[PDB]
Amino acid sequence: AIAQLATEYVFSDFLLKEPTEPKFKGLRLELAVDKMVTCIAVGLPLLLISLAFAQEISIGTQISCFSPSSFSWRQAAFVDSYCWAAVQQKNSLQSESGNLPLWLHKFFPYILLLFAILLYLPPLFWRFAAAPHICSDLKFIMEELDKVYNRAIKAAKPIVEQYLKTKKNSNNLIIKYISCRLLTLIIILLACIYLGYYFSLSSLSDEFVCSIKSGILRNDSTVPDQFQCKLIAVGIFQLLSVINLVVYVLLAPVVVYTLFVPFRQKTDVLKVYEILPTFDVLHFKSEGYNDLSLYNLFLEENISEVKSYKCLKVLENIKS
Amino acid sequence: AIAQLATEYVFSDFLLKEPTEPKFKGLRLELAVDKMVTCIAVGLPLLLISLAFAQEISIGTQISCFSPSSFSWRQAAFVDSYCWAAVQQKNSLQSESGNLPLWLHKFFPYILLLFAILLYLPPLFWRFAAAPHICSDLKFIMEELDKVYNRAIKAAKPIVEQYLKTKKNSNNLIIKYISCRLLTLIIILLACIYLGYYFSLSSLSDEFVCSIKSGILRNDSTVPDQFQCKLIAVGIFQLLSVINLVVYVLLAPVVVYTLFVPFRQKTDVLKVYEILPTFDVLHFKSEGYNDLSLYNLFLEENISEVKSYKCLKVLENIKS
Amino acid sequence: AIAQLATEYVFSDFLLKEPTEPKFKGLRLELAVDKMVTCIAVGLPLLLISLAFAQEISIGTQISCFSPSSFSWRQAAFVDSYCWAAVQQKNSLQSESGNLPLWLHKFFPYILLLFAILLYLPPLFWRFAAAPHICSDLKFIMEELDKVYNRAIKAAKPIVEQYLKTKKNSNNLIIKYISCRLLTLIIILLACIYLGYYFSLSSLSDEFVCSIKSGILRNDSTVPDQFQCKLIAVGIFQLLSVINLVVYVLLAPVVVYTLFVPFRQKTDVLKVYEILPTFDVLHFKSEGYNDLSLYNLFLEENISEVKSYKCLKVLENIKS
Amino acid sequence: AIAQLATEYVFSDFLLKEPTEPKFKGLRLELAVDKMVTCIAVGLPLLLISLAFAQEISIGTQISCFSPSSFSWRQAAFVDSYCWAAVQQKNSLQSESGNLPLWLHKFFPYILLLFAILLYLPPLFWRFAAAPHICSDLKFIMEELDKVYNRAIKAAKPIVEQYLKTKKNSNNLIIKYISCRLLTLIIILLACIYLGYYFSLSSLSDEFVCSIKSGILRNDSTVPDQFQCKLIAVGIFQLLSVINLVVYVLLAPVVVYTLFVPFRQKTDVLKVYEILPTFDVLHFKSEGYNDLSLYNLFLEENISEVKSYKCLKVLENIKS
Fold first, then answer.
1. Residues on the Extracellular side (chains A, B, C, D)?
2. Of all helices (H) and strands (E), which one includes residue D129?
3. Closest-approach residue (CA) in chain B for A5
4. Do A320 and B215 touch (CB under 8 A)?
């Protein structure tokens, strides 16, 4: 049913579930904005595929041909199913809108799944090529900050700074993040163009002329030379196409904004720890397209997990 | 079946289940009134979608056309399924109530799901944009109160007050909560208007004239020029529409009352802790549209979880 | 199948399962008599909905119309399904028992689910508006009694009394319990009246006259002007209606007895603890409609859970 | 399938599973003979309901009417399904065996489920009205015996007796057990009588005369005045009825023997503990219809669970 399909792809952690794996220590290796874009760009095409051909919205089969009244049921069943297979054969289907529009109508669910998988590949590549490096690095910095905070409490009663300085002049990981977003934006635009073209097709194009004339039936003057067939699940296609087109148009600026890594990050995420006597070093140097920008974005995204940071955040917020 | 569908969306934690996630410490980041509104505004449209087209209430298919007796089964099957697809084509369906009412009848389950997802978006946005900030902040205040209470017991045998004062002059989080409720109210009103319009449609409008006359059949004087078709699952639509309309009308004041954040909160939630010698500070300053109002509402909502508060509540309640 | 549906709603904890939630400490916040009433008032309507339209008891579809022998299968399928949709259209169905009885027959499963959900709302409201307050309060009194008993053992080798005195003059929670039972009784009576009216309908009323005469078919003298249709799953409806009517009649006095909160409670539930030297205070003052009556009923319901009470119960029972 | 249905209700803990609930401490609150009677009296009617209408044993639908050859498929489908609904209408079905036998044949699965639920009610009442009292009491006596045994070992290197004496003169719980068995026996006898009457019905009674003559068809001389219909799934009914009848006849003496509570119990279950110097008191006084008899039966049923009893049992068994 439509409602329970909606519960499967929406209202539940379809792919936004936390990585319940005993190697990440409960961390998240994809940002909230990236997770939202991936879930929407994947969940929607799969949801529309399910909704287009679900029950309670579609009657009968996909295609139906008007066979003559003298045909039996099996002869008409042959005609209907022949013309469904007689879409990829040029010497047939004398349609008034060309051969391409009928190709898209037959394989529209396949095309929706095609770029749904393509959109999911960069997130999958990021989780298997760069995410473990982020998890390994973040698992050390967070522990190091806890040790510094504990030592500061002992004192009251800069290895990370050197590490971050080294990572500034090594753009090995930021380029991978930029590329993954860039391919995701490109595939979204390609899907945006295709849906716009599909929605622009004339509605009076699903129907086409058909003829069972090949071999034996060719020299048998007992069947009509032209059959009227119609691809029925097409009006639903042109309704979900524009819905997916609108969402992708709205989602494209989000990916474009995500591309500007240095703009998103702020250069005071670790400024909270500069008041500790043990630290006593500057944690901010500059900005730009470098791995440090990616680390700051990742750190800021899940910095509240450690208990030490929140206590420092409260202490430095009392400035009234 | 209807009963087990009811068990799926009602009588169980469809979306009101606690966030069993190892990052919230068992806290709840959405209030009881907000959770109830979200569950009803989402569960009901999905329940009505399932009930409208479930078995044991619907016979046959969605549409049926009265083909002439001279037509075969496959010809009549073509006619019935053609006219189902011949609803989005203007040069057909000479209905007596216009083109729009047949559009709504065909895609009524789609429209119900459309604003069901739209109503769920603000709760989803709140849980991924502002809920972690609430969880991070509440996890520190509750621990701080426990430490103060433990220190008070040691003494017998104001960092939070400064923190709350700072949060009064920063309306960064309350505006997000107000906006999320405002969009939820707007979508409810939009759904309220649409259901009222749909229920106001004349019942003698699902049936429409149909004609298979396009291309080959156009110059073939063998089929009747007018077919009588009927959208059958329409009377059920106009029954669940008014049911959803009534609930949304009843649910609208709840969202309106939820909008008035300062009115809902009380300015003595932390007054219980003012008797401790270590605290010895005022926890109440004033009211208004500020983050402090949201924090007080969130704190009061789940203040009984900590064991320290209940003991203080019992101690201060003995005033007879 | 009927048997496995019975196992789903009966013979298992459909909604009487314990609240396996890490916030109640294994306590029960609804009494045995209230749980039994809620389970019966909810399980039975859902069971009857499943049994009425399950397989092995129903043949074919819900409605069948006697089409003339000259009609094809699809024409007869149109007639049967048209008249099923032609029940909510006044200018048709010239029945001999009126328009209302056919409305109830078509939507009888919907009506059964309607008050099944309505009956479940007060228990749901009680579990989300007053149950956490009971759990928070009972979790403190039971711990306090254990501490008093432990102190008494130390002595051998009245904060609660003051708390209960304060709760006597605050009828904030008992009114909510009285209201929830009152609405449950009202909905039961409303369901009792409806089932009695439905069972009183003449059995010779499911069948009705039908006519496919609207638009094109109106000026086409080829189809009969009157069709004989019958709502078939009606005799089963009038059998389960009286079964649900009998149970609700038997269940109504149970809710009425549950309303009398002061009568149910006994004023010696905490009298067992009065022998301890540390307690040495009276735990019983009077009765009436107050929160103390509700607390005593809740305490007595699950007082054997604590190990201290049972030992005191055995000690004070040796009076032969 | 039949085999997997058998695995569902037989060969598995359908309702004999242990109460996996964190409030019983692994104890069993229903005796082996009572559990066996409840499982058989419930599992068998549900098994027969599944087997009667399962696939691979039934062909087609429940009822079939011999329509004239001039009728179309839909007309014959109307006739077959009308007469299935035309069983609860007196002015029809001129059967040669009366109106009652056709009522039972149509609703035989409903009647099997009716007393299947009725038989399960006393066990359900016992588990929610008297079982927690037994669990609370048995959880204290067993712990007390362990403490006495531990103290006896310390001595080598009568609170329960007083408690049992008090429970002799309080028949508050035994009457509930006697009543539950008595209603179970009565319902078994009522089911025994009904099955005997149903099996005694003549096999030449499922078939009956039918007539679609009401309203429009009444003054239409085109259809035959008498249709021959047959309730087909009736011979299977009279086979499972006698099978259930035989089992209930065999099961009735077991319930009758279970009624004699004092006869079943033995007055030396706690005699094993009389050799301990700390105990040094008599644990046996007399017999009769009292709560002590029920406690002894419950204690003897699960006395081997405690490790102390088995060691005493071995020690006192060395008398050769």
1. 61-105, 203-230
2. helix D108-129
3. B46
4. no
